[PDB]
Design a protein around this ligand. Structure first.
Ligand SMILES: [Mg+2]
Ligand SMILES: [Mg+2]
Ligand SMILES: [Mg+2]
Ligand SMILES: [Mg+2]
Ligand SMILES: [Mg+2]
Ligand SMILES: [Mg+2]
Ligand SMILES: [Mg+2]
Ligand SMILES: [Mg+2]
Ligand SMILES: [Mg+2]
Ligand SMILES: [Mg+2]
Ligand SMILES: [Mg+2]
Ligand SMILES: [Mg+2]
Ligand SMILES: [Mg+2]
Ligand SMILES: [Mg+2]
Ligand SMILES: [Mg+2]
Ligand SMILES: [Mg+2]
Ligand SMILES: [Mg+2]
Ligand SMILES: [Mg+2]
Ligand SMILES: [Mg+2]
Ligand SMILES: [Mg+2]
Ligand SMILES: [Mg+2]
Ligand SMILES: [Mg+2]
Ligand SMILES: [Mg+2]
Ligand SMILES: [Mg+2]
Ligand SMILES: [Mg+2]
Ligand SMILES: [Mg+2]
Ligand SMILES: [Mg+2]
Ligand SMILES: [Mg+2]
Ligand SMILES: [Mg+2]
Ligand SMILES: [Mg+2]
Ligand SMILES: [Mg+2]
Ligand SMILES: [Mg+2]
Ligand SMILES: [Mg+2]
Ligand SMILES: [Mg+2]
Ligand SMILES: [Mg+2]
Ligand SMILES: [Mg+2]
Ligand SMILES: [Mg+2]
Ligand SMILES: [Mg+2]
Ligand SMILES: [Mg+2]
Ligand SMILES: [Mg+2]
Ligand SMILES: [Mg+2]
Ligand SMILES: [Mg+2]
Ligand SMILES: [Mg+2]
Ligand SMILES: [Mg+2]
Ligand SMILES: [Mg+2]
Ligand SMILES: [Mg+2]
Ligand SMILES: [Mg+2]
Ligand SMILES: [Mg+2]
Ligand SMILES: [Mg+2]
Ligand SMILES: [Zn+2]
Lengths: 60, 127, 97, 23, 83, 206, 97
RNA sequence: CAGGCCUUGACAUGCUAGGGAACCCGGGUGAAAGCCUGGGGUGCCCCGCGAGGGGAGCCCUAGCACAGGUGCUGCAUGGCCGUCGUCAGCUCGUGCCGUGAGGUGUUGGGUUAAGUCCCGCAACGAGCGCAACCCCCGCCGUUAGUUGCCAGCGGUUCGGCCGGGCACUCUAACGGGACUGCCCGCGAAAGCGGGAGGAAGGAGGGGACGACGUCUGGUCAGCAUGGCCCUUACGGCCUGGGCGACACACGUGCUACAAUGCCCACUACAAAGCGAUGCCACCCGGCAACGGGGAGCUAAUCGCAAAAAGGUGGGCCCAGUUCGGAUUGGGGUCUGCAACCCGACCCCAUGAAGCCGGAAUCGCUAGUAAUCGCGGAUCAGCCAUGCCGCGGUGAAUACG
């Protein structure tokens, strides 16, 4: 049960609470950042390829 | 006329202004002994001029920002040691051997992932 | 006390008691068996019986495998005995000047 | 100590306010 | 507990079948999944079946169980001890 | 598994982002999603032209998609027949003024994304994986590179036991930040499963 | 007569603050130099691994750099060649008064 | 998990027809989903003063291909990660030695954090690692001067508030700076010890960075993917329950057992972040959580904001207590459709165990440990005492 779950998260819900975020890239339900709309795994995948504008590896 | 040094320590930045006078010292709109009231470490902030005898010879205008009291205190020590050298270049010797001229680079080490603090490691059962 | 984990596998309370009775061979050496932990598992060729035990003189770690689950259990105890008897007597070797 | 809600230190620990830590 | 500014919550679909029974000479047994509904005084004296996830439990409402929820009286976990 | 992405390790020092534009907190995710939708279609369609990179710019409700490729004509077509065709299927998605440029690749055998793809194609064609890898390295070095290393992992030849196969020539200093190293990945999809192809190309230091 | 510039890369940001300071400077008259506002840092810390391995992370940042310029002595002669402003793609300009 | 439901299906590309496009507000039944419905107007290009005919941009009804599966296999796999280990190792080319596996180099003497460098040598070179190139911090400079700052001058309604200025602090971009470069001494050399200068000294402190490989390591449940298995069901929707159970057992943590302490009142001193159905000043109501007003801020401007330890003053007087704050009764607040299972917070009352912990065992070498608070991601709310960060105060010891 994932594809139906990916579609049911898009569908506006019968109540405002039932809304939750998924990963727009892989459908992952957990650890979804709202800034990117991505999960932690896709966040690191796109950032490593340079396809996140501005996002760079941070060291200090 | 007026003499200035820049003093920094940890996260404190102190700007000190040495004008000749009887000895009065004011830190951020307060008397010295009122700003550091009840702090034992304070007197160390005046040590550079006790080393070049300018203890009562100067008045002190001092601003202070950032960090905490003792960091601000050590910042003063560098600041007024900075000012006395521009006040007189030969004040370096018999002030530099007292270390008062160097800037203390020891600062908070960054917290790292996997640890609880900078180095404190999580407990585990190897058994 | 002694803990038993059946990873990705179901066992009975009888099986767990057999394990406790088999680990009881280690009581021979009269040393504290501290929080002993057995892990029974199933691999494509047979069963794996893991164990980690701490004693006052060191730790015991050993793994036993065999098609028959009880044999893998027994092979584990054999490997654990040889380690315990090494922990209990190795210090006696460097005794003479 | 910190675990006592009815004290100032307890309300600081929880990040809350009330009669024993006003705002 | 729920804010007093808000109302005493009943699922409205359960409240309705209460009054139709009241206004006609009750009672029939009420089956419901409204564990969240409060036991308002109009319910006092009825016997209502509460779904616990498996069974609808017949719960006879009395006078002293009013400021409560229906779930409190059809517990969900079967437990009889250990050993 | 322990190696950092050699491109991501060099963003801002030897490599520039594939999507250059500012955006604010309420906008970033929406543009970014469009950027990946743009790449999702374009990478499927322009595969056969030798798609090595897709730069993307954004200013004010418009976007300037650059395409780096080895066969520019396969993208353009007859006088611009497919190039104009694209800008329509493109602006249908973008919903705005999606200008599309094309730029050729100097040497398609000094571009790691292409070298990896060529090996991945040779693998799906059931070529000697070990030989093919030595070929790619030999082609990149003959094309003048200062170092090259290709990796292929998985059921090579169909074997039940997966295996990794690699070859290298010259210098490939992945710890060196100032070394210009191009990295590309390609997915050989076979009847027995998936293999992964990683090409490293060393174009000199800076 | 205010212009503030925001961008993710500071190399393009500073160049795009020079080609404004330089622009209306000679174009008459006064230009208050590019003042770097403090940078807003937006941090991203994730587990390197797709599954467990909780004690291994990788840090990412997204820095939103800021610049301010005051074209002090306006003169709508300047308010023209600024209408055709060749600024790179990475930066965003605001004009207020 | 239980029950109530749906069968090209919540979703893709299709081909064929009925209606009509599409759509919007409702009616009934039901827990809801569903089932049953009741209304109402499709451009185009079309013969159109005319019934009438399409077609196709889109949905609804029937098919048949197909969808769908977080069903199995990490022992068929890609990807990414953990680990040994930031340990200094792992190899190749040619030559030499050996019937051959293989050796040599890479060993050796010296040196280094280092296969680091020096000298030697049937070896001579090369690669992957080491280091460096990158980030933060520490000193100074240049460019900048607001929303940041205030040295002096003028006002000053008592506020850098205004005038004024960019000095200073700062903020943030670019530079300089440290190289055993200089001196003394040992040394063949590489280096080692000591000295000065210097903000910094011998990698300046921390970061990012992880070789050939290992663990048939981890993940088919993030994703991908071979193969196998399900097809009114192992697919899909709903409502409710469960994931929070509790004779027990282990791992990680929080708060403690008190006087270097606890409580109350007053008063200081940060950093990094976040913030337009957001952050909320200030006023009013409430003991309070909070509520009602309401300014400011697309935010170096307004706000979260008070930092806490500390400092001052007062109480407690060694008691299971003014230590500790578990447990429970009662009364409220707020979010949310909904706090029974199963939320956080406030208030009254209750006030447990615990008097420093057996066998055993963990962390830490300096701004570290210890201790003190602050912020963020996730997020309606929150079960965070977690995690990732930030500064305050600031040790002990290393013979070996
Ligand atoms: Mg299902
Ligand atoms: Mg799927
Ligand atoms: Mg939610
Ligand atoms: Mg989510
Ligand atoms: Mg700073
Ligand atoms: Mg004093
Ligand atoms: Mg700290
Ligand atoms: Mg662990
Ligand atoms: Mg057990
Ligand atoms: Mg035996
Ligand atoms: Mg404490
Ligand atoms: Mg108390
Ligand atoms: Mg942990
Ligand atoms: Mg594996
Ligand atoms: Mg794997
Ligand atoms: Mg497994
Ligand atoms: Mg395995
Ligand atoms: Mg021989
Ligand atoms: Mg050999
Ligand atoms: Mg050889
Ligand atoms: Mg070797
Ligand atoms: Mg060897
Ligand atoms: Mg040696
Ligand atoms: Mg080393
Ligand atoms: Mg040699
Ligand atoms: Mg080397
Ligand atoms: Mg200046
Ligand atoms: Mg030395
Ligand atoms: Mg390195
Ligand atoms: Mg999968
Ligand atoms: Mg599979
Ligand atoms: Mg087959
Ligand atoms: Mg549901
Ligand atoms: Mg539940
Ligand atoms: Mg759980
Ligand atoms: Mg037990
Ligand atoms: Mg805890
Ligand atoms: Mg503690
Ligand atoms: Mg006592
Ligand atoms: Mg008592
Ligand atoms: Mg007692
Ligand atoms: Mg008490
Ligand atoms: Mg209560
Ligand atoms: Mg609840
Ligand atoms: Mg204590
Ligand atoms: Mg002991
Ligand atoms: Mg150490
Ligand atoms: Mg906190
Ligand atoms: Mg929340
Ligand atoms: Zn994802």
């Amino acid at each position: 049960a994932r594809k139906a779950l990916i579609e049911k998260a898009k569908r506006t819900p019968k109540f405002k609470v039932r809304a939750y975020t998924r990963c727009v890239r892989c459908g992952r339900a957990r650890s979804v950042y709202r800034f990117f709309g991505l999960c932690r795994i896709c966040l690191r995948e796109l950032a490593h390829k340079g396809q996140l504008p501005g996002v760079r590896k941070a060291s200090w | 006329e007026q003499y200035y040094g820049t003093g920094r320590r940890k996260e404190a930045v102190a700007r000190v202004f040495l004008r000749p006078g009887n000895g009065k010292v004011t830190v951020n709109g307060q008397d010295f002994n009122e700003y550091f009231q009840g702090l034992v470490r304070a007197v160390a902030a005046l040590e550079p001029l006790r080393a070049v005898d300018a203890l009562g010879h100067f008045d002190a205008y001092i601003t202070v920002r950032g960090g905490g009291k003792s960091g601000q205190i050590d910042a003063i020590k560098l600041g007024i040691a900075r000012a006395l050298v521009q006040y007189n270049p030969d004040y370096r010797a018999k002030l530099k051997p007292l270390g008062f001229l160097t800037r203390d680079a020891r600062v908070v080490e960054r917290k790292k992932y996997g640890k609880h603090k900078a180095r404190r490691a999580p407990q585990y059962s190897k058994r | 006390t002694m803990n038993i984990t059946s990873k990705q596998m179901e066992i009975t309370p009888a099986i767990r008691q057999h394990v406790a009775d088999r680990l009881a061979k280690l009581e021979k050496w009269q040393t504290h068996l501290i929080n002993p932990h057995i892990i029974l598992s199933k691999e494509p060729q047979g069963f794996v019986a893991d164990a980690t035990i701490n004693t006052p003189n060191g730790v015991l770690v050993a793994s036993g495998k065999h098609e028959d689950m009880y044999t893998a259990i027994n092979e584990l105890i054999n490997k654990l005995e040889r380690q315990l008897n090494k922990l209990q007597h190795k210090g006696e070797a460097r005794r003479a000047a | 100590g910190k675990g006592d809600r009815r004290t100032r230190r307890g309300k600081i620990w929880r990040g809350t306010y009330g009669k024993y830590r006003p705002r | 507990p729920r804010s007093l500014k808000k109302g005493v919550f009943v699922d409205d679909h359960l409240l309705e079948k209460v009054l139709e029974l009241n206004a006609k000479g009750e009672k029939r047994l009420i089956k419901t999944w409204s564990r969240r509904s409060t036991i308002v005084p109009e319910m006092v004296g009825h016997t209502i079946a509460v779904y616990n996830g498996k069974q609808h439990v017949p719960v006879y409402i009395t006078e002293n169980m009013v400021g409560h929820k229906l779930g409190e009286f059809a517990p969900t976990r079967t437990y009889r001890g250990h050993g | 598994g322990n190696k950092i992405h050699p491109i991501g390790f060099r963003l801002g020092i030897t490599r520039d982002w594939e999507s250059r534009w500012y955006a604010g907190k309420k906008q970033y995710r929406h543009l970014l999603l469009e950027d990946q939708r743009i790449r999702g279609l374009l990478e499927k369609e322009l595969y056969s032209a030798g798609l090595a990179r897709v730069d993307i710019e954004r200013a004010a409700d418009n976007v300037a998609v650059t395409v780096h490729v080895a066969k520019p004509g396969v993208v353009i077509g007859r006088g611009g027949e497919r190039i104009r065709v694209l800008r329509e299927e493109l602006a249908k998605l973008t919903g705005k003024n999606v200008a599309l440029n094309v730029q050729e690749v100097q040497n398609p055998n000094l571009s790691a994304p292409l070298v990896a793809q060529r090996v991945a194609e040779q693998i799906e064609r059931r070529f000697a994986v070990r030989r093919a890898i030595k070929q790619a390295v030999q082609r990149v070095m003959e094309s003048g590179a200062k170092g090259a290393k290709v990796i292929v992992s998985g059921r090579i030849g169909g074997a039940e036991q997966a295996r990794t196969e690699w070859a290298a020539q010259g210098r490939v200093p992945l710890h060196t930040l100032r070394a210009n190293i191009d990295y590309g990945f390609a997915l050989a999809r076979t009847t027995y499963g998936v293999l992964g192809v990683k090409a490293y190309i060393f174009l000199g230091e800076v | 007569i205010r212009i503030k510039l925001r961008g993710f890369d500071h190399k393009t940001l500073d160049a795009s603050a020079q080609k404004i300071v330089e622009a209306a400077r000679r174009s008459g008259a006064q230009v208050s130099g590019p003042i770097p506002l403090p940078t807003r840092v937006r941090r991203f810390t994730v587990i390197r691994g797709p599954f467990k391995h909780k004690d291994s992370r990788e840090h990412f940042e997204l820095r939103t750099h800021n610049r301010l310029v005051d074209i002090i002595n306006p003169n709508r002669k300047t308010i023209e060649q600024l209408m055709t402003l060749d600024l790179p793609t990475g930066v965003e300009i605001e004009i207020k008064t």
